Design a protein around this ligand. Structure first.
Ligand SMILES: CCCCCCCCCCCCCCCCCC(=O)OC[C@H](COP(=O)(O)OCCN)OC(=O)CCCCCCCCCCCCCCCCC
Ligand SMILES: CCCCCCCCCCCCCCCCCC(=O)OC[C@H](COP(=O)(O)OCCN)OC(=O)CCCCCCCCCCCCCCCCC
Ligand SMILES: CCCCCCCCCCCCCCCCCC(=O)OC[C@H](COP(=O)(O)OCCN)OC(=O)CCCCCCCCCCCCCCCCC
Ligand SMILES: CCCCCCCCCCCCCCCCCC(=O)OC[C@H](COP(=O)(O)OCCN)OC(=O)CCCCCCCCCCCCCCCCC
Ligand SMILES: CCCCCCCCCCCCCCCCCC(=O)OC[C@H](COP(=O)(O)OCCN)OC(=O)CCCCCCCCCCCCCCCCC
Ligand SMILES: CCCCCCCCCCCC(=O)OC[C@H](COP(=O)(O)OCC[N+](C)(C)C)OC(=O)CCCCCCCCCCC
Ligand SMILES: CCCCCCCCCCCC(=O)OC[C@H](COP(=O)(O)OCC[N+](C)(C)C)OC(=O)CCCCCCCCCCC
Ligand SMILES: CCCCCCCCCCCC(=O)OC[C@H](COP(=O)(O)OCC[N+](C)(C)C)OC(=O)CCCCCCCCCCC
Ligand SMILES: CCCCCCCCCCCC(=O)OC[C@H](COP(=O)(O)OCC[N+](C)(C)C)OC(=O)CCCCCCCCCCC
Ligand SMILES: CCCCCCCCCCCC(=O)OC[C@H](COP(=O)(O)OCC[N+](C)(C)C)OC(=O)CCCCCCCCCCC
Lengths: 43, 132, 54, 491, 90, 77, 642
């Protein structure tokens, strides 16, 4: 048996099993670094 | 010999507060003239930041022997007693009972000691006399 | 998950409360009830210091 | 008609004290009869009114039934429902009694503006009294934060050297925290559409939504009653605040948080209270242990008592969160007992010693029993009452709270017994030092206790002993009301 | 004079009628103080029995003490919120 | 009025320092050791007794179901 | 006749406390002695009815607690055990009051000393007459409050103001555990009445029973000055001699033993606690008897004598022989009260008012009455056959071997050492002060006389009771089969038969043979061969002497390592928490952050068309960016603040 602690968490849209198609971090992080590099560099 | 009380710092840096090494006022000479004679403090003397643990009202500090010397002796005292007790227990040198422990009739007064039924009996009974 | 979106989907407390309808399934986040199954309290509070036993 | 009489009378009284004094401003120099003898004719009016307010509650007391379940004297005034039950009767009664003593404590130790001081005290007393007799969370909050406006100005105008530091602390600590209680009060008004006590007592919320509401309300409570680690405002405020402010602050205001647990947590968040009760005990017990060790290494006279009040308010919280009548009744008695002993200590420390020698450093004073014997007598007696002596009312509160904790949690609740030992160390070390060894060389011999200062101590001591010897004057009223808060199912 | 207890079990009422819900809360309380009083009377016998019996108090007060310990755990104020806000049948 | 307390200059520096220790406090690796003990070791220390034994101690009238006294004496001889 | 026996000292205590200024000094001492005298008479009347005619009394005043099932009343029962505690307390306290009239004659504060002294007597009477454990606690606390005032009576003496605080605080440590034990009594049983609780002893769990009585034991250690909490006992000599003549005979010291005796119905069914009680006594008896032999103060030696003799009552409890301990408690209240009064007369008789026994010598001819009281007391303290000490002290030591257990055997030697040590330091005290060559200036001896009749009357009354009283009162308590059900002795624990029959002859005389032989051997060495007892030669014998003379260093270990450490924990919280992290996470820390941020902001407000133009154009990027990138801009915006 576990411990009975309070759970102060707001509800969220729970993605059940078979959902939550993963996002490609390598490409997603590439856009931020290249995009933010140009703006600060260009300015 | 005359060690300061424990938990007294050596270096404190409290802004512009004057730097003075702690002096325990309990060990000051009572015979000298003092303005605060009861506390043995001259008027307007600078006070250490932790002076509450050094003035008279602080717990008395016994500086007769080293603290680790005290623990050595105090532990030594009970080491002998533990030695004396442990030696006897190993061989069973303490005397054995000269007779059977005290016995009682009526199944050892089981009912008289709050035993409702014959099932409890041993839950409440004292030593039982088997020569009824 | 906001109360307004939950309210518009029937997860709120618009129609008042009743105590004869005891829901076996756990209530929603924003939902309120008059009375709750004992087994849910045992799952949350745990048996012990005055729940079921003493 | 209690509330209707109570608000209207004070509002009438405030205007009377406003009219008589501020009529003479004009263009003329203040040659007036009213301000003759330090506004003696305008202080006496203020002292009479605070006495009268005590007579208002007594009129409604004789009708109060100690056996009927629920709120009594239910009245609608200003579109707000006002009711009195067993718990609200004694806290209102205690609050009004501290009214006259707060005014009388600062009768002759102010530099001016006595009319402003008197009106400020009465407004604090009435608003505190009205806080126990409301019937919704919103109205509870309104009277729970309206006191900030007079309290912030009272400390700043009539404070010590560091009043600027303390005036911010009382205003911001009790607003940056109680706001976190406004969020939880608002959530009830959204999902239930009313904040009325009886309406929300019967509604159960989800397991998560009770935790979010409990945290929002416990934040506004753990600050109002100083609980570690957000207790760092009261010692500053108590050191700087005037004697009238210190009497009311630790006498009634800090007990609002104990009453806040009764109204805002136990009935409507009953399930989550059982989940948070082990957490409260770890926080409270460490508050008791730390606030009693911290007091040992203090120096300031009025700060020393300030941390003493924190320890005896940790015992209240330990008792109230126990899920039995033994814990709840003792927690309430201790609040009543601590409502007289704690204000009494500030009269000795910050109302008699400070008013003569004008310093608050424990290094100066010692051996005051040599030329101030009457001061020592009340110093020793109020010291032994404050430590949990059996003949005092603190013991009855401290025994039942400790016993109430053991019933709820026999293991960790055993540490609540530390209040028996720890309260003796920091307290008597003050009383031993203040009345020990030769008379101090830094203090000249002055007048002993006067008639005014004796009067306050005698009328703050007698209620403490009466509750201690025979607490059934208090227990009988609470027994029905306190039995409602208990949440347990036995099969 | 001596007003009685309006016996009203929660399972019979609808909580919406506030006057009824007050009755079911008050009734559950007033039947819990009667059990505590019956505990005091039972324990008032145990004290008198123990003193008069003397050394015999392990046999002349056996049932009285046994009943007292059996009834002690649940003869105390339990409150109504425990049974109001819970349904044991589920 | 008449300055009944013979104010000591060095007492004031003492009280002034004791009321302003927080200004000179620095969060070194030693203050970090004492903060951890007093706020994360002890509170978590009692955070396990308060939960490992919560609802596990039914002590109200806990009866005895076990004999106490030995019945048959075996001498060492 | 019950209500008169209890509250009469309270009336006498208040008269001198508040009306004392109006009734002078001499007329205020005798009224206080009058109030106690009424109580002494009323106790014997009760003792006649209770012990002999088996009548019990109870006056229930009014209720005190009525919180659900927990009911506690302000009641005071007077049963056999209660009267057997009223005989030592009330009788000695009257004699202490009678003694204090002429002892404190020169003290400037006499209307106040007798106000607390009688208040002490009333505080003890409530303790030994409450009919529920809470009323006992009301009395139990007020021994400490009364002692704190009396021990720190001369509040202008630094060593005495601090000594009162030490005696008050260590007792509160005991009272802290007693409160916890009382709570578990309410938890397990639902009440703290003697009748309700004791009737359940055989039906309650052992662990729940063990937990309560361990708390009682820790509470008792403080009061009976047992091992680990005995520092306050010797520090209590700072008070007046009548205070030591009362606290250490039939008062605060003995109050630990009474609590354990009252709890006999609960104490029986936990063998583990009775083992701990037995072992505390043996060590405390052994240690105190050793410390007393190298101490060099007349009141320290007698004070250490009580701790050894109280420990003898503890080992008698540990063998479930509660009758023996109670009987030895009554006896010890007379041949230990007499020692203090007589010692308090030696210090008074000498005009230099010395207390060190090394400044005495050859006083036997000069003050033969004070010597005779000590000598009779000393023999009784040494359990010489025929005296009160023999009928009580020997039988307890007899039964250490009489249990025939391993633990019982070990404590027997600890008792036997302390039985001999009692005979060794008693001779040392008398020889150093009555049979030694003079040390004080010769001017003292030509003024060394006796005292007045008022100071002499109590000592003669106690002298007689120190010879005959043990014989007359033996069969009431130690008789075979005497009905004393107020103290429960389980049938399996009745080992009184084996003690009085199976002990060889050698054991019955061994404490006397070593006591008489050891004393005389020491007496010759002290007289003709004193060169040996200069311990500064043998460094081993110098270190040994300097070890027991400092009381096993426990005073040094308590002060320098626990109180000094305990105070430092409070300093750490004050510095690193109260004024530390909670100030960085508070007004002082938030002032820095606010000043940092507000410094950055105030730079931005400056009249410049180009400045306001770029931000307007910059904000147009919010519309362009996909709104999944708001958190990054938020992170960047914080970076630029720095
Ligand atoms: C002169 C005329 C006297 C006023 C007569 C009157 O107008 O009656 C209105 C009302 C009486 O109350 P009623 O409408 O009969 O029903 C109860 C609801 N209060 O009476 C009133 O509404 C008077 C209310 C004004 C008095 C309170 C003023 C503000 C109080 C602020 C309190 C702050 C703490 C909360
Ligand atoms: C200034 C004075 C202040 C007061 C002094 C300090 C108070 C705290 C120290 C004492 C704590 C009270 C004693 C509680 C432990 C014993 C209670 C008990 O008897 O129950 C133990 C409980 C199991 O119950 P039991 O009946 O013994 O076993 C049946 C198993 N079927 O469960 C157990 O087996 C063990 C229970 C936990 C053990 C922890 C006890 C020490 C607590 C230390 C606190 C942290 C430091
Ligand atoms: C410091 C300044 C001085 C001010 C404080 C002085 C100390 C205060 C002393 C008095 C304390 C107030 C309590 C007295 C009021 C009486 C309490 C009471 O109501 O008794 C209840 C008792 C039984 O209750 P019941 O059957 O319901 O009948 C009452 C119905 N009206 O009904 C009765 O039969 C009445 C019984 C009256 C008993 C007389 C009161 C005795 C008080 C003194 C003894 C206190 C208890 C012992 C403590 C001494 C230390 C051990
Ligand atoms: C066990 C856990 C440790 C508990 C310690 C409590 C924390 C620290 C509280 C002590 C605070 C210091 C204080 O109370 O004031 C100092 C006072 C000085 O007394 P002192 O100087 O020795 O008197 C000499 C007279 N010539 O010192 C005192 O008088 C305090 C008296 C002692 C208080 C209780 C000490 C602990 C007793 C249990 C020890 C267990 C050993 C076995
Ligand atoms: C109270 C609840 C338990 C808290 C335990 C705290 C123990 C502790 O923090 O010990 C630290 C302290 C020494 O630490 P400190 O002063 O920083 O050493 C500097 C040396 N130059 O060491 C001490 O002060 C001794 C504390 C012993 C605790 C047992
Ligand atoms: C502190 C040091 C004191 C001396 C060392 C004791 C060593 C020893 O051997 O002590 C062992 C003892 C005895 O217990 P036992 O052998 O099980 O008793 C046998 C069980 N009967 C009696 C039922 C037959 O128990 C203790 O420790 C007791 C506590 C000591 C004081 C704390
Ligand atoms: C319980 C319900 C009460 C409701 C009515 C309240 C009336 C307020 C007073 C108005 C008249 C006035 O402002 O007058 C000013 C008065 C009197 O000043 P004085 O010292 O006599 O002036 C003397 C001037 N000389 C010396 C030159 C002659 O002082 C006060 O400000 C005190 C009361 C208000 C302080 C805090 C106000 C903020 C309130 C916030 C929301 C609660
Ligand atoms: C004055 C200072 C105030 C301090 C307040 C202290 C409150 C008490 C803290 C209790 C923490 C606790 O109970 O922690 C333990 C929990 C539970 O998880 P577990 O340990 O794996 O459970 C073990 C379960 N078994 C043993 C059955 C497998 O862990 C946490 O998730 C801690 C989260 C809390 C901190 C964020
Ligand atoms: C059984 C044995 C009982 C002890 C008999 C020793 C005689 C005694 O204690 O006295 C003998 C001597 C000295 O004589 P004194 O009266 O103590 O000191 C006289 C006063 N001077 C010194 C100022 C002149 O002391 C001791 O070496 C005490 C040793 C005690 C510990 C013994 C071993 C510990 C285990
Ligand atoms: C979630 C738990 C909530 C607990 C209550 C909130 C924390 C207490 C803060 C009190 C500060 C105070 O009172 O401000 C007083 C302080 C400083 O004091 P000073 O007068 O300048 O003295 C110091 C004098 N020096 C510095 C010159 C030596 O001013 C400030 O820094 C102003 C900014 C305050 C920011 C408040 C933000 C609140 C956020 C709360 C949500 C996290």
């Amino acid at each position: 048996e576990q411990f009975h602690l309070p759970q102060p968490f707001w509800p969220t849209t729970k993605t059940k099993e078979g959902e939550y198609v993963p996002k490609d971090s390598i490409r997603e992080a590439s856009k931020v670094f290249i995009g933010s590099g140009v703006l600060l560099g260009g300015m | 010999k005359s060690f300061l009380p424990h938990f007294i710092p050596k270096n404190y840096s409290y802004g512009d507060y004057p730097r003075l090494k702690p002096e325990n006022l309990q060990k000051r000479d009572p015979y000298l003239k003092y303005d605060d004679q009861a506390n043995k403090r001259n008027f307007n003397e600078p006070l250490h930041p932790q002076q509450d643990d050094l003035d008279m009202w602080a717990p008395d500090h016994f500086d007769f022997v080293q603290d680790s010397i005290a623990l050595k002796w105090f532990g030594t005292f009970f080491g002998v007693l533990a030695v004396f007790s442990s030696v006897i227990y190993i061989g069973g040198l303490y005397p054995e009972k000269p007779a059977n422990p005290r016995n009682y009739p009526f199944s050892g007064l089981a009912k008289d000691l709050g035993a409702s039924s014959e099932e409890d009996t041993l839950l409440y009974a004292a030593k039982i006399d088997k020569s009824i | 998950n906001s109360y307004r979106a939950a309210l518009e989907a029937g997860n709120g407390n618009e129609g008042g409360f009743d105590n004869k309808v005891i829901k076996t399934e756990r209530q929603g986040f924003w939902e309120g009830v008059y009375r709750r199954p004992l087994s849910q309290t045992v799952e949350d509070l745990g048996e012990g210091r005055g729940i079921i036993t003493q | 008609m209690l509330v209707q009489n109570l608000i209207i009378f004070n509002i009438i009284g405030i205007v009377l004290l406003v009219l008589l004094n501020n009529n003479n401003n004009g263009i003329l120099n203040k040659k007036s009869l009213l301000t003759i003898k330090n506004e003696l004719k305008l202080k006496q009016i203020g002292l009479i009114i605070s006495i009268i307010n005590i007579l208002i509650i007594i009129e409604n007391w004789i009708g109060f039934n100690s056996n009927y379940y629920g709120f009594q004297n239910i009245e609608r005034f200003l579109n707000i429902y006002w009711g009195i039950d067993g718990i609200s009767l004694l806290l209102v009664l205690l609050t009004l009694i501290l009214g006259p003593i707060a005014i009388l404590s600062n009768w002759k130790n102010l530099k001016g503006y006595y009319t402003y001081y008197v009106i400020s005290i009465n407004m604090l007393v009435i608003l505190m009294a009205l806080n126990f007799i409301c019937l919704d969370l919103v109205s509870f909050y309104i009277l729970f934060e309206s006191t900030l406006a007079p309290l912030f100005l009272l400390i700043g105008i009539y404070g010590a050297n560091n009043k600027n530091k303390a005036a911010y602390y009382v205003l911001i600590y009790t607003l940056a925290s109680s706001l976190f209680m406004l969020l939880s009060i608002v959530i009830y008004y959204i999902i239930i559409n009313s904040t009325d006590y009886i309406y929300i007592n019967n509604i159960i919320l989800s397991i998560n939504l009770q935790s979010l509401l409990f945290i929002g309300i416990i934040i506004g409570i753990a600050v109002k009653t100083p609980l570690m680690p957000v207790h760092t405002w009261l010692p500053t405020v108590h050191s700087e605040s005037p004697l009238g402010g210190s009497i009311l602050l630790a006498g009634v205001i800090l007990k609002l948080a104990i009453y806040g647990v009764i109204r805002l947590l136990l009935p409507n968040l009953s399930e989550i209270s059982m989940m948070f009760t082990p957490i409260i005990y770890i926080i409270s017990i460490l508050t008791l242990i730390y606030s009693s060790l911290i007091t040992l290494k203090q120096t300031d006279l009025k700060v020393i008592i300030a941390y003493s009040s924190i320890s005896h308010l940790a015992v209240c919280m330990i008792g109230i969160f126990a899920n039995n009548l033994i814990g709840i009744n003792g927690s309430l008695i201790l609040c009543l007992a601590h409502g007289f002993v704690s204000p009494a200590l500030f009269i000795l420390v910050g109302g008699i010693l400070y008013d003569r020698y004008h310093n608050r450093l424990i290094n100066y004073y010692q051996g005051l029993s040599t030329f101030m014997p009457i001061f020592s007598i009340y110093l020793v007696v109020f010291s032994f009452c404050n430590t949990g002596t059996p003949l005092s009312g603190n013991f009855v509160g401290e025994f039942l709270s400790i016993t109430g904790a053991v019933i709820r949690h026999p293991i960790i609740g055993s540490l609540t017994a530390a209040s028996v030992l720890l309260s003796a160390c920091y307290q008597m070390k003050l009383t031993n030092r203040l009345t020990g060894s030769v008379f101090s060389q830094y203090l000249h011999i002055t007048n002993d206790v006067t008639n005014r200062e004796i009067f306050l101590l005698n009328w703050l001591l007698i209620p403490t002993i009466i509750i201690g010897i025979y607490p059934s004057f208090v227990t009988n009223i609470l027994n029905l009301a306190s039995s409602t808060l208990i949440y347990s199912v036995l099969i | 004079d001596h007003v009685r207890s309006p016996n009203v079990s929660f399972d019979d009422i609808d909580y919406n009628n506030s006057q009824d819900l007050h009755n079911a809360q008050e009734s559950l309380l007033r039947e819990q103080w009667i059990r505590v009083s019956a505990l005091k009377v039972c324990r008032k016998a145990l004290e008198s029995c123990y003193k008069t019996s003397g050394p015999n108090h392990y046999e002349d007060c056996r049932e009285i003490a046994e009943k007292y310990l059996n009834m002690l755990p649940d003869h105390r104020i339990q409150g109504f919120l425990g049974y109001q806000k819970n349904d044991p049948s589920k | 009025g008449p300055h009944l307390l013979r104010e000591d200059a060095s007492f004031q520096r003492y009280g002034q320092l004791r009321d302003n220790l927080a200004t000179y406090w620095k969060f070194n690796r030693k203050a970090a050791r004492n903060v951890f003990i007093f706020l994360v070791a002890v509170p978590a220390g009692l955070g396990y007794l308060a939960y490992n034994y919560e609802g596990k101690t039914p002590f109200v009238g806990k009866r005895r179901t076990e004999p106490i006294f030995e019945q048959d004496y075996v001498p060492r001889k | 006749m019950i209500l008169l026996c209890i509250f009469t000292p309270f009336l006498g205590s208040l008269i001198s406390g508040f009306f004392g200024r109006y009734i002078g000094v001499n007329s205020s001492k005798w009224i206080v002695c009058l109030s106690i005298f009424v109580s002494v008479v009323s106790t014997y009347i009760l003792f006649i009815d209770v012990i002999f005619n088996e009548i019990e009394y109870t006056y229930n005043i009014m209720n005190w607690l009525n919180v659900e099932y927990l009911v506690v009343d302000w009641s005071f029962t007077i049963d056999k055990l209660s009267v057997s505690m009223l005989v030592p307390v009330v009788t000695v306290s009257f004699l202490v009051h009678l003694y204090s009239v002429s002892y404190m004659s020169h003290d400037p504060h006499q209307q106040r000393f007798f106000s607390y002294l009688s208040m002490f007597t009333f505080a003890m009477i409530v303790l030994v007459t409450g009919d529920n454990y809470l009323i006992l606690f009301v009395g139990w606390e007020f021994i400490g409050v009364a002692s704190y005032l009396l021990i720190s009576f001369w509040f202008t003496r630094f060593n005495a103001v601090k000594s009162g605080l030490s005696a008050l605080l260590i007792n509160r440590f005991g009272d802290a555990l007693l409160v916890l034990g009382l709570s578990y009594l309410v938890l397990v049983t639902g009440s703290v009445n003697y009748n309700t609780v004791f009737a359940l002893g055989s039906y309650l769990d052992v662990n729940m029973i063990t937990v309560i009585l361990i708390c009682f034991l820790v509470a008792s250690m403080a009061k009976s000055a047992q091992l680990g909490l005995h520092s306050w006992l010797l520090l209590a000599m700072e008070g007046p001699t009548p205070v030591s003549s009362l606290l250490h005979a039939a008062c605060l010291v003995i109050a630990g033993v009474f609590l354990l005796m009252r709890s006999s119905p609960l104490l029986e069914y936990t063998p583990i606690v009775l083992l701990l009680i037995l072992w505390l006594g043996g060590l405390s008896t052994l240690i105190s008897g050793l410390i007393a032999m190298v101490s060099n103060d007349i009141k320290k030696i007698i004070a250490l004598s009580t701790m050894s003799q109280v420990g003898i009552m503890m080992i008698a409890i540990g063998v479930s022989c509660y009758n023996l301990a109670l009987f030895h408690l009554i006896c010890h209240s007379f041949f230990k009260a007499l020692l203090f009064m007589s010692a308090g007369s030696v210090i008074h008789s000498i005009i230099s008012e010395y207390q060190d026994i090394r400044m005495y010598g050859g006083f036997r001819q000069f003050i033969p009455l004070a010597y005779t009281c000590i000598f009779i007391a000393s023999l009784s303290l040494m359990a010489i056959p025929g005296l009160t000490g023999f009928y009580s002290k020997d039988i307890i030591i007899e039964s250490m071997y009489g249990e025939y257990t391993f633990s019982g055997f070990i404590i027997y030697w600890f008792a036997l050492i302390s039985a001999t040590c009692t005979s060794l330091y008693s001779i040392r005290l008398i020889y150093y002060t009555f049979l030694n060559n003079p040390n004080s200036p010769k001017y003292i001896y030509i003024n060394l006389k006796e005292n007045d009749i008022v100071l002499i009357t109590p000592m003669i009354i106690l002298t007689i009771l120190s010879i005959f009283g043990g014989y007359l009162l033996r069969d009431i308590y130690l008789g075979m089969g005497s009905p004393f059900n107020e103290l429960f002795i389980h049938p399996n624990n009745l080992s009184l038969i084996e003690t009085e029959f199976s002990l060889p002859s050698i054991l019955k005389v061994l404490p006397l043979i070593t006591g008489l032989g050891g004393g005389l051997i020491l007496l010759l060495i002290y007289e003709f061969n004193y060169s040996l007892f200069l311990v500064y030669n043998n460094k081993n014998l110098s270190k040994l002497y300097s070890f027991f003379n400092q009381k096993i260093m426990f005073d040094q270990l308590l002060n320098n390592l626990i109180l000094r450490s305990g105070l430092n924990i409070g300093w750490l919280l004050n510095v690193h928490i109260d004024r530390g992290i909670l100030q960085l996470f508070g007004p002082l820390g938030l002032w820095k952050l606010s000043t940092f941020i507000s410094s950055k902001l105030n730079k931005l407000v400056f009249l410049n068309i180009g400045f306001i133009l770029e931000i307007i154009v910059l904000s147009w990027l919010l519309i362009v960016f996909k709104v999944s990138l708001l958190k990054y801009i938020l992170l960047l915006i914080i970076f630029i603040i720095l």
